[PDB]
């Protein structure tokens, strides 16, 4: 649980840094924003593929067996996660700003949850790549969040403040992750699949298409590297 708390803290720190760069930038081009959001989306997609689905398939493979029951566990967890983020996306001037904040929070939930779930078995080979990747994507997402809050009408100070506070969803999401992943033996792969599907829904809601494609591939590739090296 401690390593997951440190991971969520790294998420909030990265989001805070990216948010603080907006104090100096104030505004950015559409190509830069699309490239950053595509980069983060690719990092999150490949993070769902290689850092959540597959390690959960291995864990359920050692808990249940090599048969299709493990893939059934992970897959059902994934469907439950997609259904969860779908329900959250359905059931939910200054009001528009609040809606933007809510969208940011629901975006940042499955990533903290991904950290906490990934640090359930204590394996650094599972948690470290996903956590580091979530910080690396969290910097441009903090920047884009602050700049987007400034473009809608908030001063750059208020926007950076709301962005830094939006980074607090990663630690809370991590506590939820270790909460749902440490109940029983099957809770770990089910939670891996759940976080994977939740993040796939979020990035599906987050995906000048050429530039965004350059970022998407650029950090899908980055991400495969992080999973291979760590």
From Swiss-Prot:
Binding site for Cd(2+) 2: 108, 111, 138, 141, 170
Subunit structure: Homodimer. Also exists as a monomer.
UniProt binding sites for Zn(2+) 1: 111, 137, 141
Record's keyword terms, sorted: Cadmium, Cell inner membrane, Cell membrane, Ion transport, Membrane, Transmembrane, Transmembrane helix, Transport, Zinc, Zinc transport
Topology with respect to the bilayer: Multi-pass membrane protein
Protein name: Zinc transporter ZIPB
Catalytic activities: Zn(2+)(in) = Zn(2+)(out); Cd(2+)(in) = Cd(2+)(out)
Portion held of the full protein: 56 to 308 of 309
Domain notes: Has an additional transmembrane segment in the N-terminus compared to many other ZIP family members. This extra helix is important for activity in vivo.
Function according to Swiss-Prot or TrEMBL: Selective electrodiffusional channel that mediates the uptake of Zn(2+). Exploits in vivo zinc concentration gradients (maintained by cellular zinc homeostasis) to passively move zinc ions into the cytoplasm. ZIPB-mediated zinc flux is dependent upon pH, but independent of the proton motive force. Is also able to import Cd(2+), but is not permeable to Co(2+), Cu(2+), Fe(2+), Mn(2+) and Ni(2+).
Residues that, per the record, bind Zn(2+) 4: 89
UniProt-annotated location(s): Cell inner membrane
Family (UniProt): Belongs to the ZIP transporter (TC 2.A.5) family.
Binding site for Zn(2+) 2: 107, 206
Binding site for Cd(2+) 1: 44, 107, 111, 137, 141
Further remarks about this protein from its record: The zinc flux through ZIPB is extremely slow in comparison with typical ion channels and is nonsaturating with respect to a zinc concentration up to 2 mM.
GO terms of molecular function: zinc ion transmembrane transporter activity
Ranges facing Periplasmic side: 27-28, 153-154
Organism: Bordetella bronchiseptica (strain ATCC BAA-588 / NCTC 13252 / RB50)
């Amino acid at each position: 649980v401690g390593y997951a708390v440190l991971g969520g803290a790294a998420g909030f720190a990265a989001t805070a840094l990216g948010a603080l760069m907006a104090l100096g930038l104030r505004a950015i081009s559409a190509r830069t924003q699309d490239a950053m959001l595509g980069f983060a989306a690719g990092m999150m997609l490949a993070a769902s593929a290689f850092s959540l689905i597959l390690p959960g398939l291995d864990a359920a493979g050692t808990i249940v067996g090599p048969g299709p029951a493990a893939a059934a566990v992970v897959a059902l967890g994934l469907g439950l996660g997609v259904l969860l983020m779908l329900g959250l996306d359905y059931f939910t001037r200054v009001n528009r700003v609040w809606l933007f904040v809510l969208t940011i929070i629901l975006h940042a939930l499955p990533e903290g949850m991904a950290i906490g779930v990934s640090f359930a078995t204590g394996d650094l080979r599972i948690g470290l790549p996903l956590t580091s990747a979530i910080a690396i994507q969290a910097v441009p997402e903090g920047l884009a969040v602050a700049l987007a809050l400034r473009a809608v009408g908030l001063p750059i100070g208020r926007a950076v403040l709301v962005a830094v506070a939006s980074g607090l969803m990663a630690p809370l999401g991590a506590l939820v992750g270790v909460g749902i992943s440490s109940g029983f033996a099957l809770a770990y792969p089910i939670s891996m699949g759940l976080a994977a599907g939740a993040m796939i829904f979020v990035v599906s809601h987050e995906v000048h298409e050429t530039t965004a494609t350059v970022g998407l591939m650029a950090g899908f590739a980055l991400m495969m590297f992080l999973d291979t090296a760590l």
